[PDB]
Amino acid sequence: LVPRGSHMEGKKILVTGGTGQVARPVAEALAERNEVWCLGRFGTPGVEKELNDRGITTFHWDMDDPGAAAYEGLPDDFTHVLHSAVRRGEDGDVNAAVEVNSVACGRLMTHCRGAEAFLFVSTGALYKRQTLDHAYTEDDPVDGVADWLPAYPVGKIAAEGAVRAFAQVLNLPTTIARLNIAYGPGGYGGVPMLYFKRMLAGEPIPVPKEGQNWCSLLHTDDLVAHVPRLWEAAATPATLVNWGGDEAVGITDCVRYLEELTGVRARLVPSEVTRETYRFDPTRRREITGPCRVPWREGVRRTLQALHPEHLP
């Protein structure tokens, strides 16, 4: 039993994507005992205020500004950087996804070239499909294919190229962590709660025509604990790691568990295109972080208790 603020102390941390599902808990945890700055647009009313109240310095910063003006007034003595902000490309503009994310990586790394470690969050969506249940490793083939969000993996391959190159040119120790499905009791709860909201609405949930999709769910409390360890593993050349939990979780199994807990019935629709998650081989991540602690059934149950308690018996 140890407070999560004790994972790291006395540092000066820059976080992008600090309003988001992944990096907000990291920024909040690290703000207790470190100086934490969150850079973003803060378009959601009240979020900047909550971050400020929770001890975080906020700085307006928009990746869509192509010039360098976005960095005026930003300190250059951060020790640690988490770059989690993303333009996924839902609008289908693949050139914009490539340009905006890649240039932001280069400008941010250059600004923070004196830092001890830079952590870039990426995705497993860029893996080439083998089978739906395969445990993807860091060396498995890559393609730019995600039918559910086509521009997203392409933008991430481009950004990873920029990150690798700047890590070497600047001699800035870096980790590229290809993240799996994050979930937890903050925000909107992650993909598991997106599917629960579809269940409540009677909206169809696309599933594969053969088999089910698989993932390596990663709970917030484990994700937060891993960040200091991922910084410690940063290197030149950049360290690459598939970042997921320790349990293989079937997506349809997760939906069935939501049904069991709540009594709400799901509508599964076999489809050519699904939200195509993958599970990861946890070998390399475990080498860096040690084992995860939160079992997924316990974690999902408590996420429901936090965000949808009225639907639990």
Place this chain on the structure above:
Amino acid sequence: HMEGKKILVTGGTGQVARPVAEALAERNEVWCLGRFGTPGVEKELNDRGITTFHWDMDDPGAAAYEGLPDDFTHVLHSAVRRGEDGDVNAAVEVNSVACGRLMTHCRGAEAFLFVSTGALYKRQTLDHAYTEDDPVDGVADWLPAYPVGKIAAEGAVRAFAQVLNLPTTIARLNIAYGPGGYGGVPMLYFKRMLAGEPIPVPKEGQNWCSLLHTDDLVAHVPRLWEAAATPATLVNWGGDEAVGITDCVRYLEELTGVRARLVPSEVTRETYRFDPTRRREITGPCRVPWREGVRRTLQALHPEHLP
């Protein structure tokens, strides 16, 4: 036209950039950076007045850049590790880092030209004319690590162009052909015809490309440098004509009397036609018609097979 410049070329032993380097050497100081593993190729370049500098993208660190001048005015980055061995991380790392180190070293240049590929476009219909805004998926079953490495390298190039304020053009090249080297895809098909090998073609229709003759390719390079900008200028770099692959092979047979052994197949190598609108705005029209170009290339490489 270009004179009095100082030009850094990578990939100067290759099919694309060697004619460019040789043509620029007449009125400019040209340096070719590479490994020169082919016996005799380094001296062939030196005999044109090209300065050669041993430079290996596989080398870790910045040691490969020791002693390299930093006052180049123009850069053509054509060298590539395509990833034939399947090691996708090595291909992504080597190419991306080389782009970053080269651009940073040459951050004072007037313009940087990066050669990319059309293979990264998401496949549409056989005769689709791909534009610069068409979707991308990095799929190439024939060389999986290659388009992925080009997407990664393009991301590095775009980022360094902005960070360094280095005007850049990214030119996604089509199929190049001409009398040098082994002649390009048209001559590879002719070699198969000479060997009596089967030529796979689609069961319906044909594959389409935008062949670019190397005389036109050479002429375009100064214009591509002139179009360089921040953010990087993106252009699909092909010829002005949609060329059917089956039509090309049939024309080879028509010229030579060597029979082409076409075999309809569900699996054939994919080729891409480019919309030439943006390239033409930058370079003007091409000058080599494809039938003349293919015939002249045959005359250069296989003269005994023309009547």
